[PDB]
């Protein structure tokens, strides 16, 4: 099984990992880095701890559509505090969610240990500042338009575009010195895709392994699971569950969640049946 | 994929369909129990198990009289208001008889049918049977002490009970398979039985699966019974990836939902 090294930190990646995703928008009657923000949030980071995540996924992203905009100082105002304060407090790894190179330089500075990139670094200067950082770094692939297959269009060629981005950016890491093992792979449910193709992509989730990077997958209240249950994203605990358990079936080392205690038990349950499963 | 007959009643086995427990055991009122059937209906529920004596290990031991007040009234209840089927979960044959004649539709029986009378009343019944494979001692693996070897007992059990089942005139079609999962087996076992629950698909029998919050669950997380939903729906979705036909649960709202997750990835599964 592969082991994820980010500096003086170790993991072994021989199950499914949790990834706790804890967005640090303040409430309304608060701003990044008082304290009642920081308490709210550490609180959080606590209960993840406890529970045996593997991961803080910290995002300064506005969760709050009602608030008309968030500046660049603001979005640090809310990442950095919090993260200086679980790095100094846990040993748990952080991982910094963003896609700004001021925002990964600045986060990895105080303590962030990973970086989730939905832009798989092609913002500018960001594969720079990811090799200066030093750190572990997910990719995620965002699929342009779909691709079917010859051979039955009703189903999607799910492999065709994927690789040539993944040769691609394994190369451009290569060419600022951050080596393959330092990479994660996220396929990027959600974005634009139909409900059959992000099913097909779960359905067959265990063929990514081939590209020898761990895998991140990320359904936790997307839309594929709460319309294919006609439901509101609040109400898609139960169909989030089970997107994780095929995912953890399929050997995905991470799993990135909202509700990170339930996901705790289902990769108890699903390590329980690989360990008495042949081969 | 089966069809599943029940004199008028007719289910197609294609898919997850889900039990759904009803709780008429002090373990409550008989108006609570017939809400709580209407909410299975509306969730899309297949079956509504009715039991008066729990199965459980350790569970109390129910007089003949109080098995029967416990089931008769919220059977004829839900028989009345909805087409749904009712299994009665028993092993008494008097049981069975007085079940079926108030709307019981599929009779769910933990000793497959072997009491006094059971096999010529499910007969009579002409109504499909769930007959539950109840393993009294494990077996190893010849090979390999540190797992089981899942088919040797089973196989035998099958074969024998179809045959005395088609001596009182009970076709194969009638039949579904509960493989056992708890019954005093090990951690390991029950989760090795769920690992290789697709190869139970062999005999040709449609497959029922009921793991929730049972042992298996509870202890491995080393949580309160009640702490057990999350767990027990990992192990639904994991026996819906694998195809059984039945999923028996307490917690049907939301094994609706992960049944629909797990038939939208087989559904795109290439």
């Not at 500075?109 to 913002?123: H, M, P, S, T, Y």
């Not at 451009?172 to 059959?196: E, R």
Request: aromatic share 6%; glycine share 6%.
């Amino acid at each position: 099984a592969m082991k994820l090294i980010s500096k003086n930190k170790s993991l072994l990646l021989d199950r499914s990992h949790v990834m706790g995703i804890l967005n640090v928008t303040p409430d309304s009657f608060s701003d990044g880095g008082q304290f009642t923000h920081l308490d709210a949030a550490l609180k959080q980071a606590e209960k993840m701890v406890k529970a045996g995540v593997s991961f803080i996924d910290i995002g300064g992203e506005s969760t709050r559509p009602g608030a008309p905009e968030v500046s660049l100082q603001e979005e640090l105002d809310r990442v950095l505090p919090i993260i200086e304060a679980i790095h100094q407090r846990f040993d748990t790894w952080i991982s910094i969610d963003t896609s700004k190179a001021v925002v990964m330089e600045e986060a990895v500075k105080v303590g962030a240990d990973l970086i989730n990139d939905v832009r798989a670094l092609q913002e500018p200067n960001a594969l720079k500042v990811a090799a200066e950082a030093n750190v572990p770094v997910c990719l995620m692939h965002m699929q342009g338009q779909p691709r079917t297959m010859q051979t039955n269009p009703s189903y999607q060629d799910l492999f065709t575009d994927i690789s040539s981005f993944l040769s691609e950016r394994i190369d451009a890491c290569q060419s600022v010195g951050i080596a393959k093992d330092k990479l994660i792979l996220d396929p990027g449910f959600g974005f634009g895709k139909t409900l059959a193709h992000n099913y097909q992509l779960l359905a067959e989730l265990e063929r990514f392994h081939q590209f020898g990077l761990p895998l991140l997958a990320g359904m936790s209240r997307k839309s594929m699971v709460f319309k294919l249950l006609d439901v509101e994203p609040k109400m898609a605990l139960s169909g989030s569950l089970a997107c994780a358990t095929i995912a953890a079936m399929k050997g995905a080392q991470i799993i990135r969640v909202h509700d990170f205690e339930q996901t705790m038990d289902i990769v108890k349950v699903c390590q329980a049946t690989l360990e008495q499963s042949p081969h």
